[model samples]
Target: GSHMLEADLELERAADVRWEEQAEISGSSPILSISIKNEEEEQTLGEDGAYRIKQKGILGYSQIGAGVYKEGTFHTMWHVTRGAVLMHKGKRIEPSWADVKKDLISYGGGWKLEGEWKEGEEVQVLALEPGKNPRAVQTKPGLFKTNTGTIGCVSLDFSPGTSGSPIVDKKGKVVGLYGNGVVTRSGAYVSAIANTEKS
Candidate 1:
């Protein structure tokens, strides 16, 4: 009996050790960055679809912004490289950059979709991790201006893995998409892909 007691204590310690070593694991632990391939050509297409934006305050975030999905492709942000086929969910398709410009031009037909972002208001930054599901990053609010000279974007608290995250309001409406942000004298200077022209 005494010998069995020692064995039980040792077993408990083993369990404790496992828990101590793996406690950091979460829902995101198992996912990994996808490897895009060019099996037919027998060569990797340059990690196929890996695009890293190296900035002071940016992260590895990626997302699909506002767009309509046609036959096989979604017309949205023009970040995807030209003449390359991307695989998502086992379906391969190439991004159509030309259609993206046309889509934006015809997006909002003289009506306000999502309203302007206000400072101090809570917004959600939705990004894709290594998996298909999205995780949200919350930020401290401040407004920024676009190239169109409109103060229509917002700054976020610096977060990693948020490259193409969409900034949405409390109502789940998109205000902008995370572009790139850098460290400033004050704090993180973040910007989103803003819809400049009023629609």
Candidate 2:
């Protein structure tokens, strides 16, 4: 139960395969190639569900992960290398562009579009690591701060596979999700969609 507006618009964009490939490589988020399976039949969830698909590309970031659902849809809040595409049964799903109807604010360096900025703030990260015990880690406070999204320069160095990791504050509040592009100290960035939706 998600809106297909953004994903639909992206698919509608007129571009060559090279351009598409380049964009996919640099984009901050990844396309959730989701499919629903019912017994012997398999179906692509794109038609029935709402997803987040980026049109252009960002500088850099790390992995991606699943997002929350609101107003009837699944959202793309993480990055994936392989199995991120397949969909399965779950009570709550992620959010989609349709769910986030507001136009995305272009990402620029510094100064948040929307929250309080806290420097060197300690936080917790909830990430997925196969065959690992309790995939959670604590990190030092991030450097720069914005109202809308979170970016690199946080205390801990984000690895390649922790794209969808959630940054949690001391009070058990999620500050942001991990990145999905070429993640670097200066290149990494997070989505403001989580913060935007709450506003």
Candidate 3:
């Protein structure tokens, strides 16, 4: 009887998790809505299609202002590599040193990359949701090893879709982007990426 009760509990939790993933397609997740596109038609392109210029970015990237140089805009604040993107498993893509220049679509609020996120120092990630004021989850800085070296990451438990969230330092300036799916939960250090921008 106890086993049966436990099984039921697990099933319920499973349903909840399924719904959380489902909630994303509606564009309600806190993460940025970055996607590759068909250069000809200007529609969001998928993994592959019969189009001449198939877009890149099936992965994800960090958010700066809003993933662009906002001419009086927040889209100017995004921080991304010059490759394909999203808020999913960024581990799948190698980090590059090129500037994104454009992403066609970007989401989230305005912010600036100000201070550095030191190792072991505490910081907060903006965890936004619909019908609520933006909130944050506190965590400490950690590291995500790459073949080249290591990128910044936060050792914490966050829900899916928050990969592109900003990692704000104590001073209120952004220091990094949430895993953005580069990993389960981490931010590629803003200093690391920002210093390399040629643009």
- Per lDDT, the best of the predicted structures is 1
Error of 3 at 137 (Å): 1.6
lDDT of 2 by residue, 1-199 (tens): 7543222112111111011222223422222221421121111112222222222224321112223222233233323312122233322222222222331111112212122225555544444322121234555543434455444334334443334344455444445544433234467543332331321
lDDT of 1 by residue, 66-91 (tens): 22222222323344222233343334
lDDT of each: 0.34, 0.31, 0.32
Off by over 4 Å in 2: 1-75, 78-86, 90-95, 98-117, 145-152, 155-159, 180-199
Per-residue lDDT of 1-199 in model 3, one digit per residue for the tens?
Answer: 3432111000000000011221223323322221421121222221110001112333421122112211111211123222333222221221222334322223232333454755676665554321222345565555555555555655435433333345555665556544333333343322222211121
In terms of lDDT, which candidate is stronger, 1 or 3? 1
For candidate 1, the C-alpha RMSD (Å) to the true structure equals 18.9
Separate clash counts for every candidate: 7, 27, 19
- Relative to the true structure, candidate 3 has a C-alpha RMSD (angstroms) of 17.7
- Candidate 1 residues lying further than 4 Å off, grouped into runs, are 1-83, 98-120, 129-134, 156-161, 181-189, 196-199
Candidate 1 TM-score, true structure as reference: 0.41
